[model samples]
Target chain A: MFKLLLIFADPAEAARTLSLFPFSLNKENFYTYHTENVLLDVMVLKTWGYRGVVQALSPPPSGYDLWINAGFAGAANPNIPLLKTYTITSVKELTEELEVTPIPRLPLAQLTSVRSPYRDGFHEHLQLVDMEGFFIAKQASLVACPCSMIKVSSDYTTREGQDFLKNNKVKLSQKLAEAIFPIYSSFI
Target chain B: MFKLLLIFADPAEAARTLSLFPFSLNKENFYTYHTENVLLDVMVLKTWGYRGVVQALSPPPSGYDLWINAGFAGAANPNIPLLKTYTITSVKELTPTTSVEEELEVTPIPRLPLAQLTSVRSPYRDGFHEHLQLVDMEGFFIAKQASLVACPCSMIKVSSDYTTREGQDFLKNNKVKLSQKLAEAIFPIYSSFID
Candidate 1:
């Protein structure tokens, strides 16, 4: 059985998600809250006896074997009908001396997560755009564990995601359910 | 018209040294009991308004501009007379990636200063001993500063020739004249210290 960790940005969202999933799905496991940040999320996961850490954003701690950064991200092409799920395979290196390195098993896909898509051509410098993946990768590196990220496309490039989600909770939850189950099945 | 800074190993040595050179030498300008080792000495000297530092036999600080090391170093040949000063102008760099670069001055005629002679070596890096330069924590870096900074730097060391009281007496008497002159010269330099 694969150990799955998740982070919810809002406590209300976490409460709603946990109600449906129910911490009892796994014994000796009950979700705990420690602020509403990614670092705290990883800490809470660690405290729950998790060997792996996952977060929506905020960096991870110094040690962890595997980091699965799962979150939402913005789509590049608004009309492309972005995939609900995609994995990042390559990340652009910041230093000029370094070239873009490919990370295995990550298929490039559109995601809607950040506050904004950032400047155009910015993606040329980085592969993924999620708040928590970098932190998860950093923490995993400290512990000598491999890190990976998965994202779901939730909003249109020009759409106001806050109101859209508030108005269509069921639609968003259904999309997440579809993405989560497939990802979870694949991970197993 | 050059300002030379001196660092002593401990407070007692500084106090005693200050006592011998009491001719309007400002005590505030003096940094006493600086370091018992080399690396920390360089770090402290860097902080104490001195771009140049020295250590007798102590740890060397990372990225020091210059070194002026003084302590009781024993003569390799006692027959040649103890406490005769020698300036190490050349250093053999131990690392192949970094060339052993020597660019400095050495005194041809040895100047004997009053101080006890004790041979001590730094416990930090063994490679430092590979060079022909006299091994003090601060001297090498201080001497090397000629190429690094705007000001010219040098290590002025006086050998305390004997470890015993009689030896101390001879060295003390011999050092008194220059020590007073150094104190007079250092006072103006110390007056410019900001913190």
Candidate 2:
């Protein structure tokens, strides 16, 4: 028997994730959607940020074998292709506090979870950032739940990048979800 | 058909809440308990602060008939009584942008002194808001969540310390006694809530 808890930080990302799967929603207060391999009992929850993810697991998510977090990330390096999903190998918070390592995967990249939607002018090297990964990764460790984070590079994290997300998160989120389904499908 | 969500910021508070009633803990991830009032289906959750409360209500709490946020707070004014419960009438986040302050109203519990509560992200060092008489980290967030869900909330706050730098240490040492006192004050009228 396997249960999956999927956490999203944005409504756009959650909706896109919903789009990719044949999950019929449960009639509950929270937006809970379920599906079957005869099988995967999937529950979805989303809040605005890390603090929200932390809260979403208020009673602490249990009875689930695996927890997955996915959303959009900002590309610190302008050249990085937007809409390409990346497997987050490691995560660190903006305060530079805890370093979290999720289940290892391929073509791995580093992610930094920030409090604010960050932006910068330029970067010569590749950097990725978002608002909720650290707490998502951190909690899975504390609860000893094997977790994974998948992020899609959506914007460059700048003034122009910021404006793009204003209208494009929903569109980019769908692309991110389409990418994640294949990767996660093997687990189920 | 009453579903009550008891949101606490401290384990001590939640434990005291469970003890005062004949509610049996539900075999779920949450500290849920149901009583023979055949009545209240109670679920309890605790985290650290306002941000934690915001996170706890992740995905937006729905289907609950009533939400209750009960815990200890510091007396914003030195002369106010301590170890007593007060029903919060309003709340505001105690931030530096005090110039744009507004009374964030809350649906208060009956039969308790109606006082203004200020939620501080940081420790309450001194009384920052003159009109506010109580301070805690999670009050404002709980109220906000309740409004979003359209569920009426009851805020019962027991003053455990005064607004000072040392109140943290003071509250820490007296947590047990404070928890007991809080439970006692609210227990007498507990059935009235269900009635």
Candidate 3:
């Protein structure tokens, strides 16, 4: 009976968000988020036999109306303070679909989603870097699902910024959950 | 029936040498290598109903022929000459393996004929810079037909001397056909040259 589903990499993020929106986390309302995005996408689209359109991270099932990709991204913009969330307007694959720009959100942002970190000198062009947004868009496009990406800036992709993985993964996860819950709640 | 089968990434490579044999290009014998290493193994094995042990670049069908992963390999060793075909002592995956090395190959490779890659490297320990790597396509070993696994596998490759797609694309696309064409013209010489 639920109409929207949001996906996150950290389990604590799911747990915290579910606590805030108890009704949405129940079995009938929304599907739980899995730790691995690709594995989850493969399971839902291939094994479980649920085919509407499967995006990499967020693919709303038939009953679900909205799909959100909620996770931490390494932002290129130093101006947009860390832990701030932004709605992605467009996504691009740095590999094969290098040329084709696939817009996932309704109003595309000036920022573009790239598959990996830029090779120095090119950092200014990127807004954020993560593993899942482009993949989510690819899968959602396949199944014609409505999907939006919500990324919270975790750190700069520099060597010093990566210390968060060991020292602050939890705090960042909480920030991500806090940022996404309100947007998802409003959508619902 | 055919005793063994070999596969190549591009048809030009397959056509280069295999075209010389008396056997024509029969649709039944030819298969499209989709270039997806894992998916290709699964599809070919599933269609052939193979339950044999699998090896890198090789998967045996249940009843037909032993599989071989014969084709070109971009040699990382600059010490070795280019395209100079050499037998792969082992094959390795791009990811980590939790299962016993020997047993993991069983569930992961093939379950019928029993041959498998004899030598392989660890991706985690070494690093993953390539998409897929293997010894041969058709010369693969299977479990049930271990007795028949005695045929010494051989690989014949030319040194185009490139590894990355960007470096090797022109030769792979253009020189491949010529290489195979030359292979066909000189098969009799090649047959005697190899022994």
Candidate 4:
């Protein structure tokens, strides 16, 4: 059986994603859902950012064939409309020179992970900015597990965008769920 | 039954604290320990800083009668000795306009000096304003939110370094030892509180 691990930065995101699947709470209270060939395990982290990613992955969960980090990202490029999905081909840390290349996929773009929320015109060189992608990619590499990042654009990284996401969390979450379900089903 | 919620910033700290207690894993795999009167629920948060604190406590845990935020802090005043625990009687945020006060309770364990804590957006170094005796990123926010719970809120801070740089270096070099000291300092008070 193929084992899959799905990680989310917020509980609302995880709940929405799982809402699309017929999942049951396991003995461990982890949401477990099965396709024809893939068994999925999900974790909703306590906070966002790189530190949270490292803390959550430390003493990594055992026995997973694939790891996926999915969340909403702020777009540095205003052209990227809200609720649109994109595949992250490469992940970069704000302070580090090295960029991590995870599994190659379609609709590829580079994602820059920052310690704090980015505002419009900040870190404009990158197409996407997120709080936890690079750290998740880094930890996946440490365990030698195949990993991928899928993010939906919640807003342009601006004060207004931040407020928008906060107020429209339910809609954003549903969009994220729709974006991830197809990719997840392909693994089965 | 009294419910106590313990918040820590990382896994190492949680693991170290759990070492001294006979705890069992709950269905969610969190370490939980109980006495006749109190049920202790522990959460090891993924991030640090004020933003992290707000996020973790945004949807605060339900049914907690008391909230304790325990972790290592940098001593803004060089006079505060390292590895000693202090009770935070008041908390100051970086903005200076907002401050919160909580009542101090006596504990059976040896009490260190009571200190005021300042929470900043970034780690405070030598050149930054050091108006407070203790500095941490999460204490003020924790206290603010925990106060809303209408339960008693307490913060236990252990001095890990005299300055920000020193604290970072010490954490890098002596993680195991620092975690142990924090755990040792907290266990007795935790027991006393529960009892």
- Identify the runs in model 4 with alpha carbons over 4 angstroms from their true place: A1-188, B47-53, B95-110, B126-130, B164-167, B193-195
Summing lDDT over every window of 10 consecutive residues in candidate 4 chain A, give the lowest-scoring window: A97-106
lDDT of 4 by residue, A62-92 (tens): 6887888888888776656676666665678
TM-score of each: 0.31, 0.49, 0.35, 0.46
Rank by TM-score, highest first.
2, 4, 3, 1
Report the lDDT of model 1 for residue B73: 32
Candidate 1, residue B36: Cα displacement in angstroms equals 81
> Distance from true position, residue B195, model 2, in Å?
5.3
Query: Residue B24's C-alpha lDDT in candidate 1?
Result: 46
Q: Flag the better candidate by lDDT, 2 or 4.
A: 4
| Cα displacement (Å) at residue A116, model 2 | 23
Q: List runs of model 3 lying over 4 Å from the truth.
A: A12-15, A23-61, A96-122, B1-195
TM-score of chain B of each: 0.38, 0.83, 0.44, 0.80
Q: Least lDDT summed over 10 consecutive residues: which range in candidate 1 chain B? A: B92-101
Estimate how well candidate 1 is docked, as a DockQ score.
0.01
Ranking by lDDT: 4, 2, 3, 1
Which ranges in model 2 have alpha carbons more than 4 Å from their true place? A1-188, B36-38, B41-53, B97-103, B126-129, B193-195
The candidate with the higher lDDT, 1 or 2, is 2
Quick one: how many clashes does candidate 1 have?
A: 34
The root-mean-square deviation over C-alpha atoms between each candidate and the true structure, in angstroms, is: 22.7, 15.0, 17.6, 16.7
